[PDB]
Amino acid sequence: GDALKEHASRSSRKICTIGIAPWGVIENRNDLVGRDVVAPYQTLLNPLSKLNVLNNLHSHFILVDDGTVGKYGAEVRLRRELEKTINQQRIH
Amino acid sequence: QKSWIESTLTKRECVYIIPSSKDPHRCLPGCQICQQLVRCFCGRLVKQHACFTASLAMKYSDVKLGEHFNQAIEEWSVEKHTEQSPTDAYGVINFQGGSHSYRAKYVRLSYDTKPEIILQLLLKEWQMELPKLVISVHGGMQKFELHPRIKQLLGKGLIKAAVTTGAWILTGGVNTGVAKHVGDALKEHASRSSRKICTIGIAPWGVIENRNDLVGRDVVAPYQTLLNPLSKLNVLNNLHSHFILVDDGTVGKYGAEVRLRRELEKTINQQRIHARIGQGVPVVALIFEGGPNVILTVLEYLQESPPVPVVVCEGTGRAADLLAYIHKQTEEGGNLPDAAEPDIISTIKKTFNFGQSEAVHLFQTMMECMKKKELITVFHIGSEDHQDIDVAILTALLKGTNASAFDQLILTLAWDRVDIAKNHVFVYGQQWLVGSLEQAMLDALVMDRVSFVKLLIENGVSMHKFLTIPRLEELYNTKQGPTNPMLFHLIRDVKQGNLPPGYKITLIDIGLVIEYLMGGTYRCTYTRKRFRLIYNSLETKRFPYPLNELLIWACLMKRQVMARFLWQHGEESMAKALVACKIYRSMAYEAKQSDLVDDTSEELKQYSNDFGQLAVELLEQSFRQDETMAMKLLTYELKNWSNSTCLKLAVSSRLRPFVAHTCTQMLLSDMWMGRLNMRKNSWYKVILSILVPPAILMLEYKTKAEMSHIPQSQDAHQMTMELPITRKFYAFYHAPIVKFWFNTLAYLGFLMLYTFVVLVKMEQLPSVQEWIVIAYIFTYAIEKVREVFMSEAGKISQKIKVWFSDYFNVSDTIAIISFFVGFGLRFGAKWNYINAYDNHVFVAGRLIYCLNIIFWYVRLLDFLAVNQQAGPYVMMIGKMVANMFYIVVIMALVLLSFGVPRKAILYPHEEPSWSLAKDIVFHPYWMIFGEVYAYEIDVCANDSTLPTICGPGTWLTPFLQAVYLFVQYIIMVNLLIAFFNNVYLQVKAISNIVWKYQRYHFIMAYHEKPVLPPPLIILSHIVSLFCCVCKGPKLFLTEEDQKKLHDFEEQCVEMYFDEKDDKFNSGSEERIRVTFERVEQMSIQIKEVGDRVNYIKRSLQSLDS
Ligand SMILES: CCCCCCCC/C=C/CCCCCCCC(=O)O[C@@H](COC(=O)CCCCCCCCCCCCCCC)COP(=O)([O-])OCC[N+](C)(C)C
Ligand SMILES: CCCCCCCC/C=C/CCCCCCCC(=O)O[C@@H](COC(=O)CCCCCCCCCCCCCCC)COP(=O)([O-])OCC[N+](C)(C)C
Ligand SMILES: CCCCCCCC/C=C/CCCCCCCC(=O)O[C@@H](COC(=O)CCCCCCCCCCCCCCC)COP(=O)([O-])OCC[N+](C)(C)C
Ligand SMILES: CCCCCCCC/C=C/CCCCCCCC(=O)O[C@@H](COC(=O)CCCCCCCCCCCCCCC)COP(=O)([O-])OCC[N+](C)(C)C
Ligand SMILES: CCCCCCCC/C=C\CCCCCCCC(=O)O[C@@H](COC(=O)CCCCCCCCCCCCCCC)COP(=O)([O-])OCC[N+](C)(C)C
Ligand SMILES: CCCCCCCC/C=C\CCCCCCCC(=O)O[C@@H](COC(=O)CCCCCCCCCCCCCCC)COP(=O)([O-])OCC[N+](C)(C)C
Ligand SMILES: CCCCCCCC/C=C\CCCCCCCC(=O)O[C@@H](COC(=O)CCCCCCCCCCCCCCC)COP(=O)([O-])OCC[N+](C)(C)C
Ligand SMILES: CCCCCCCC/C=C\CCCCCCCC(=O)O[C@@H](COC(=O)CCCCCCCCCCCCCCC)COP(=O)([O-])OCC[N+](C)(C)C
Ligand SMILES: CCCCCCCC/C=C\CCCCCCCC(=O)O[C@@H](COC(=O)CCCCCCCCCCCCCCC)COP(=O)([O-])OCC[N+](C)(C)C
Ligand SMILES: C[C@@H]1CC[C@@]2(OC1)O[C@H]1C[C@H]3[C@@H]4CC=C5C[C@@H](OCCC(CO)CO)CC[C@]5(C)[C@H]4CC[C@]3(C)[C@H]1[C@@H]2C
Ligand SMILES: CC(C)CCC[C@@H](C)[C@H]1CC[C@H]2[C@@H]3CC=C4C[C@@H](O)CC[C@]4(C)[C@H]3CC[C@]12C
């Protein structure tokens, strides 16, 4: 992300970054909730904690509902498959 | 005394006359010399005391008989034996020097003046702005010079630190040390910071060259700047602006500054740096090139409660290069390395000749200084340490003082230093409380600190959560920033004309101001039910779009740089720019209609046109990407701006470049068509179809998709769902292009009949032709009353006033009124005489008709003005009449200057008559138009047609007429040709814009005009009225189309800023200067490497042997 803002409004419509993160380690899991909502998510480092935030300069997210807060191991099974299924597509 | 200084501050004259130490010099008898040489321990020869009380002590022998028990000779005290008396000198010295007088000031206060009196002296008596920083430089005196590297830099940072922070630089002032380097740095940056840096020399009234020249109650003493040779005495350094000379003691003794200068360093800190801010004013100390009592002073400032931090610029001299290394051999706050007595006290013995008699005493002062190195900032020169000390001075106040980052941020905010905070306060790992960055945002907005608002938004302040009703209330009510006085003038004009005592402004009142400024039917969110209810009750207490509310704030507070910034954030950028244009335009108007002093009507009219241009430039950007989506932007309802459209907002502000833009003109052309595809069709098939109704069924109409960008009536958009036979007739007769030709043919047929009526003989009863003419004008007149009483603006007196601003509506009004005067006289006239024209009332009626018809032929220019070529020329004709007025006035005067003499010479036997008025103007006018009256010029010639006019003096009239026509044709007619040739292009250009602009109101009018033309329009009046008793155009967009349009707007605004940054960063002027600056930088490093490689040559010597 920090590299995106140093080259933003030049590649802001060609680079589709994707965060395949879990629905575990994240600050406001409940603010992300809401069927078809436009949830106004924050970008302030919530102090007095270790929880992490979705990096603002990304464009797409695949949050993974499982488990709980704290456990963040359920991405390797899916993210890897995406790395396998894009390759079986024909480039052109 | 007529002066606060004269009644408050004092002198200290040594009344008591201690003889000098004890011993006379020479000269065996001890009565002359015990008087003469033997000075006072005061410090002057005996007669200079001039004691008003004891002036007759010296004549006797002296004050205080000799012996006096030696103990009691030191009993003299500055405190006791010194009459406190007035100042006797406070004024304005000057310095004949580097091309300026470089003026300054002195008070010459005593010494034991109270500390508060200085602050009162500095701020009101001298009228000095309280600073945001205080630099207290220190060091030793009378040193030669520095490295030419460091010398240039120390100023460059010292100046920069002081000018950007409104700082005071406390010096000794005397041009024999610290002050010299300060001053020498000032002249290298003078006439750039000569009005922001208020240096102060708190020097004594002792060591100085001409103490007596500084004397003089309220004088402008012309003090010198030449180094008086054959001496050691010092001069006041010219480049200082203020002095506090300390009257005590004598010449030579220079120790009475520490008691006062230090107090000033203590009393400024107890002042609050700013009203909104609670932190005290900081004090810093830059020691360069110091001495032994400095090392005492450094530790005296660090040990202080609270500590005053310290800067040390290594290499300037002893104390700097010393301390820079003496607090390098240490733990962070603890102990020294392997026993450091030898090497440390070595240099302390070498720099200061001690020999262990005073070599531990300094080292003991050192080991106390290293207990706090966090406050001893040290500017490591060579390795680009903190870049030109300004960081090093300022960050020293931000290095360890256990001050929260909230206090580290406000201090940058008061200084207006963003680079410091971003690089040294918003550092990785930094941690913040919950509303600390909120309180910092409130301060930055109230203080108009625009660049700190940016820093806080980026770092993560959220305006959706920050902005609230009570905060946003405050932002209007603050008097702690660059306010607008005129806002109250608009509030008190909407409230009731009055105001309560303090009147904390409410947001409903702001809502009322905006409605007054935005005008029309604008209704603001602040005057709505829900806001009016909830505000009474004062998330609910937040705002959905906070940057729409702050843009309004910044524009009503006349805070333009904040307005431009806030504009670039959020959505609806083109709309916000057009609202800002309208707010400022209306503010500029009421400023032009208020008896205040600072008119601010060109500042506001310029701010309006700045946002006006932004809207125009965003439209062009959008139009270059997609014409059809750009036309939608003009007409979508906004819903945050009273359900208006961007085009209506621009029309409201009379913004012609927006309305005359080709995108807006393309849309207006498409609305002119209606559902008709007038690309596949021709104007003669439209006219054919108005006369042949069944030909309506063989025109090329437009699909609902081709109409997607076009606003429509509700009834017109429901018939888009499919095209059946009857829907197609609707599409035809409701198109504005059809209503035009349908009214244009009826008007032409109206003129043909009315021309027939006036040209053909008139009988008692009106003919069928004349009846049809009357019906047209009657119904045409009702049609105009409909247009006025259904226009836009509610207020009749505004509806009236706008409609009578158009040329042709004034003429139509005169035309309609004059016609029915004529019909009344024509029709109401009783024929007593059988031969018409015996009845004068009838004649006056008919002659009104024959003159009223002129109005109706000229109205054809309004129809012709619908053409793109013709219409501008019609507008030009009126503009050229206005502009040619004074040339024509001069021609009228030349005409009379000829006409009056001609008539007087040729007709000398006339009695008074109104024919005289005719005869002086008649023939001279027709001469302008090619009629010289050839056989009337010389009335005494054989071929004359006026032989009876031949008489005395008549030979003069040909000379007069020859002069007259020379002046009219050869000069005045050709001046007018030259006038028109030279103003043509600028008038044509203005007329095209005005033509294009007035095309909005013309096309919009034909959407509300009835289908039927003015003779048959009565049905559309009666029917429509009656159907209403039995019971504007909008763009309709799907939710997905609203999505894709809001995204289109955002995309094109982003392109707009990118193409500007890339157009400016790619210009040659910008590449030359970045090239310039980078070549400037290299030219240092090239030489710097040049020095290093020349010192790797030192290697070659040592390495090879
Ligand atoms: C049946 C018959 C009965 C009645 C018959 C009589 C009816 C009379 C009919 C009169 C026509 C009425 C038209 C008035 C239009 C007003 C609205 C308008 O646009 O005004 C504008 C134009 O300025 C004017 O309109 C001022 C008057 C213009 C002159 C009109 C009559 C001239 C001919 C009389 C010749 C007499 C000759 C006598 C000797 C031979 C307002 O001004 P502006 O545009 O802001 O201008 C700014 C100028 N600037 C650019 C320098 C800044
Ligand atoms: C927004 C701008 C546009 C709208 C403006 C609209 C309003 C503008 C204003 C309009 C009014 C203009 C003046 C009217 C005439 C009065 C003057 C006069 O001389 O009258 C004469 C006729 O007197 C009669 O009674 C016979 C005329 C019948 C009425 C026709 C005029 C009124 C219609 C209005 C239609 C327009 C209404 C439009 C729809 C409501 C009286 O003289 P006499 O008796 O013949 O002679 C006596 C001598 N004798 C012995 C020789 C006989
Ligand atoms: C290049 C070609 C030109 C050459 C120039 C040489 C000049 C030589 C000068 C000649 C003047 C003498 C000629 C006329 C003889 C006197 C009596 C007489 O007949 O008077 C006649 C009029 O005229 C006058 O009464 C006086 C005319 C003087 C003006 C002449 C032009 C002066 C130069 C230029 C001035 C401009 C400014 C100059 C400076 C810049 C009588 O004529 P009438 O009207 O029929 O009257 C009789 C009928 N009644 C009895 C009923 C009244
Ligand atoms: C600053 C510049 C100066 C310009 C030059 C000086 C000015 C010109 C000088 C002219 C010479 C002077 C003429 C005197 C003639 C006297 C004769 C007489 O009897 O009276 C005549 C004088 O009375 C008039 O009224 C006519 C005057 C001539 C007007 C010329 C205007 C044209 C200007 C031209 C400018 C272009 C100049 C071109 C370049 C040179 C009238 O005659 P009458 O009334 O018929 O009398 C009865 C006679 N009959 C019985 C025979 C019919
Ligand atoms: C409001 C909107 C109107 C729209 C028009 C449609 C409605 C109106 C249409 C027609 C009305 C005709 C009424 C005729 C009445 C019968 C008697 C008569 O006048 O006979 C005349 C024959 O007729 C002519 O000489 C024609 C006169 C009208 C000329 C204009 C018609 C063309 C414009 C409109 C049409 C084309 C449209 C053009 C534009 C594309 C003979 O002359 P007189 O008059 O008997 O002589 C009087 C002599 N006296 C007074 C001394 C005694
Ligand atoms: C806003 C409203 C303003 C106007 C209000 C209404 C005004 C009404 C005005 C006038 C009404 C007059 C009524 C009659 C008065 C008594 C005289 C009489 O009856 O007969 C006499 C009429 O002699 C004339 O000269 C009449 C002239 C009047 C018309 C003036 C029109 C002004 C309108 C201007 C335009 C305004 C435009 C306004 C818009 C811009 C004589 O008739 P006779 O018996 O045949 O005598 C034969 C004599 N003989 C022997 C010589 C042959
Ligand atoms: C029964 C009767 C049967 C006959 C009925 C039919 C008869 C004919 C009827 C009418 C005559 C006009 C016909 C020609 C039209 C041409 C088409 C055109 O482009 O028009 C334009 C004219 O737009 C107007 O508004 C013109 C106004 C016409 C009236 C003015 C007459 C002046 C007379 C005073 C002189 C005295 C002369 C007096 C003579 C005695 C409109 O197009 P545009 O807006 O310019 O387009 C530009 C934009 N674009 C580039 C995107 C395209
Ligand atoms: C029967 C006789 C023949 C018939 C007549 C022929 C028909 C009549 C002919 C031409 C009429 C042209 C129509 C007007 C065109 C539009 C102009 C307009 O909108 O406003 C103009 C105002 O206008 C004026 O100031 C005056 C307009 C012209 C009046 C001319 C009257 C005729 C006589 C006069 C001579 C009498 C003296 C001689 C007497 C010896 C704008 O000018 P502006 O202020 O610079 O621009 C601001 C515009 N804005 C506000 C929109 C931004
Ligand atoms: C400023 C210089 C000084 C003036 C003198 C020099 C000027 C040059 C020349 C000479 C002047 C004219 C003299 C000749 C005519 C005399 C004969 C005569 O009677 O003529 C006439 C009258 O004439 C007069 O009464 C004279 C009026 C002179 C007015 C001033 C002229 C302008 C000078 C401005 C110069 C500026 C030049 C241009 C700018 C560079 C005809 O009268 P009558 O027919 O005999 O009367 C019988 C009447 N009865 C039948 C009823 C009974
Ligand atoms: C700046 C300009 C300087 C010149 C000028 O404008 C301004 O100064 C004006 C003064 C006017 C005269 C004043 C009074 C009368 C009396 C009247 O007596 C009725 C007689 C009869 C009618 O038939 C009764 O039956 C007749 C008209 C007359 C002579 C005026 C004529 C025009 C004059 C000369 C005008 C001229 C154009
Ligand atoms: C003083 C009165 C009694 C004598 C007649 C006055 C003259 C000058 C009047 C009578 C009719 C008038 C015309 C009537 C209509 C128009 C059309 C308008 O768009 C411009 C002015 C213009 C062109 C008028 C100019 C002046 C006018 C010609």
Swiss-Prot record, chain B:
Shown segment, full-protein numbering: 3 to 1230 of 1863
Activity regulation behaviour: Channel displays constitutive activity. Channel activity is negatively regulated by cytosolic Mg(2+), Mg-ATP and low intracellular pH. Resting free cytosolic Mg(2+) and Mg-ATP concentrations seem to be sufficient to block native TRPM7 channel activity. TRPM7 channel activity is highly dependent on membrane levels of phosphatidylinositol 4,5 bisphosphate (PIP2). PIP2 hydrolysis negatively regulates TRPM7 channel activity. TRPM7 kinase activity does not affect channel activity.
Phosphoserine PTM sites in chain numbering: 99, 1066, 1068, 1099
Protein name (record): Transient receptor potential cation channel subfamily M member 7
Covalent lipid sites (S-palmitoyl cysteine): 1027-1028, 1030
Tissues with expression: Found to be expressed in brain and skeletal muscle, with stronger signals in kidney, heart, liver and spleen.
Membrane topology: Multi-pass membrane protein
Residues passing through the membrane, by range: 735-760, 767-788, 808-827, 841-864, 884-907, 954-982
Intramembrane residues: 910-950
Similarity-based family: In the C-terminal section; belongs to the protein kinase superfamily. Alpha-type protein kinase family. ALPK subfamily.
Cell compartment(s), UniProt: Cell membrane; Cytoplasmic vesicle membrane
Catalytic activity, EC: 2.7.11.1
Domain of life: Eukaryota
Post-translational modification summary for this protein: Palmitoylated; palmitoylation at Cys-1027, Cys-1028 and Cys-1030 promotes TRPM7 trafficking from the Golgi to the surface membrane.
Ranges in the topological domain labelled Cytoplasmic: 1-734, 789-807, 865-883
GO BP term, example: calcium ion transport
Sites of Phosphothreonine modification: 1038
Any GO MF annotation of the entry: myosin binding
Catalytic reaction annotation: L-seryl-[protein] + ATP = O-phospho-L-seryl-[protein] + ADP + H(+); L-threonyl-[protein] + ATP = O-phospho-L-threonyl-[protein] + ADP + H(+); Mg(2+)(in) = Mg(2+)(out); Ca(2+)(in) = Ca(2+)(out)
Predominant subcellular localization, coarse grouping: membrane
Enzyme class: transferase
Quaternary data: Homodimer. Homotetramer. Forms heteromers with TRPM6; heteromeric channels are functionally different from the homomeric channels. Interacts with PLCB1.
UniProt note: phenotype after gene disruption: Inactivation of Trpm7 in mice results in early embryonic death (6.5-7.5 days). Mice die as a result of trophoblast defects and consequent failure of implantation. Tissue-specific null mutants shown defects in cardiac and renal morphogenesis, organismal Zn(2+), Mg(2+), and Ca(2+) homeostasis and thrombopoiesis.
Gene Ontology cellular component list: cytoplasmic vesicle; cytoplasmic vesicle membrane; nucleus; plasma membrane; ruffle
Cofactor binding annotation: Binds 1 zinc ion per subunit.
Function text: Bifunctional protein that combines an ion channel with an intrinsic kinase domain, enabling it to modulate cellular functions either by conducting ions through the pore or by phosphorylating downstream proteins via its kinase domain. The channel is highly permeable to divalent cations, specifically calcium (Ca2+), magnesium (Mg2+) and zinc (Zn2+) and mediates their influx.
